[PDB]
Curated annotation (Swiss-Prot):
It comes from the Eukaryota. It is linked to Ehlers-Danlos syndrome, periodontal type, 1: A form of Ehlers-Danlos syndrome, a connective tissue disorder characterized by hyperextensible skin, atrophic cutaneous scars due to tissue fragility and joint hyperlaxity. EDSPD1 is characterized by the association of typical features of Ehlers-Danlos syndrome with gingival recession and severe early-onset periodontal disease, leading to premature loss of permanent teeth. EDSPD1 inheritance is autosomal dominant. The active site is at H118 (charge relay system), D168 (charge relay system), S265 (charge relay system). The gene is C1R. This is Complement C1r subcomponent. Cleaved and activated by autocatalytic processing to generate Complement C1r subcomponent heavy and light chains that are connected by disulfide bonds. The iron and 2-oxoglutarate dependent 3-hydroxylation of aspartate and asparagine is (R) stereospecific within EGF domains.
């Protein structure tokens, strides 16, 4: 008979033959919930005369539906202090954080939230509150928080040193993975050093603290990767002795009026890789000085990519 087909997590199967009938010559075609998930690599299985559900090439083994990163359904339009409110589906990876205070993160894979270490262990200092899958703050609250099982702060980060954000970056493993959708999708990780070329325009979305009021909805701003040197000057120019390592990078400009502010840290600096039309998280909103001013600092994710993979590789 073959019995009922195994259920394909994050995917489903359809009968090409008479529905519900699981006997010889029975034919079902498995499929993954695309574009949120993609089938690892043709989904066609039949009830073999051996009374087993088998695919021409494999058989005994059903497909695997893996999560798809950085390929949002409703991309941002080309034409946080600095304005503009994000639309549903623009940043399916944005996460809302409320540990010590409002913060942000980015969904990685299907059960990991990437964010800023300082977001967990602040300078001069709780319930790990995390929400995802929505633009409006009330809604994320109603949707409920997503319990956290593991917390993985990078080794280099140090909390006692209030002016050293080196290694600022952490990982949050959700207790239970989520179900991707047009409004909840992971972002990809960088892999080429070019994701830091000067003048490169990346995005920073968050529920920070805009100009004069609190933000009830996710907002975003586009910023260009700035020249380190210039930032390095500007920084010492104001006599700041803050750390600015190769493991960081700066963006924005002192003359820009758009910028991430109080509450956007932990959020991510997103770049739509033109080469693949997929969005990668090149940086983590780490620190700066004031807001509307200029030159913000972000953790160079590209340098922790391996560290991240290991932590979530389990």
């Amino acid at each position: 008979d073959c019995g009922q087909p195994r259920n394909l997590p994050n995917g489903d199967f359809r009968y090409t033959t008479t529905m519900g009938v699981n006997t010889y010559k029975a034919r079902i075609q498995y499929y993954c919930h695309e574009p949120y998930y993609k089938m690892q690599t043709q989904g066609v299985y039949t009830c073999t005369a051996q009374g087993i559900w088998k695919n021409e090439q494999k058989g005994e083994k059903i497909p695997r539906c893996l999560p798809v990163c950085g390929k949002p359904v409703n991309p941002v339009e080309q034409r946080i202090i600095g304005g503009q409110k994000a639309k549903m589906g623009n940043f399916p990876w944005q996460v809302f954080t409320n540990i010590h205070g409002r913060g942000g993160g980015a969904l990685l894979g299907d059960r990991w939230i990437l964010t800023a270490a300082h977001t967990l262990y602040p300078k001069e200092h709780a319930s790990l509150d995390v929400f995802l899958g929505h633009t409006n703050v009330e809604e994320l609250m109603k949707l409920g928080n997503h319990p956290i099982r593991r917390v993985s702060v990078h080794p280099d980060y140090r909390q006692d040193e209030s002016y050293n954000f080196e290694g600022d970056i952490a990982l949050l493993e959700l207790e239970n993975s989520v179900t991707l959708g047009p409004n909840l999708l992971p972002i990809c990780l960088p892999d080429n050093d070019t994701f830091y070329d000067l003048g490169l325009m990346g995005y920073v979305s968050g529920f920070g603290v805009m100009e004069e009021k609190i933000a009830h909805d996710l907002r975003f701003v586009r910023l260009p990767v700035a020249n380190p040197q210039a930032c390095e000057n500007w920084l010492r120019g104001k006599n700041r002795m803050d750390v600015f390592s190769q493991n960081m990078f700066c963006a924005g400009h002192p003359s820009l009026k758009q910028d991430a502010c109080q509450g956007d840290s932990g959020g991510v600096f997103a770049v739509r890789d033109p080469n693949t039309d997929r969005w990668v998280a090149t940086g983590i909103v780490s620190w700066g000085i004031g807001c509307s001013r200029g030159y913000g600092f972000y953790t160079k994710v590209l340098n922790y990519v391996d560290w991240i993979k290991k932590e979530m590789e389990e």
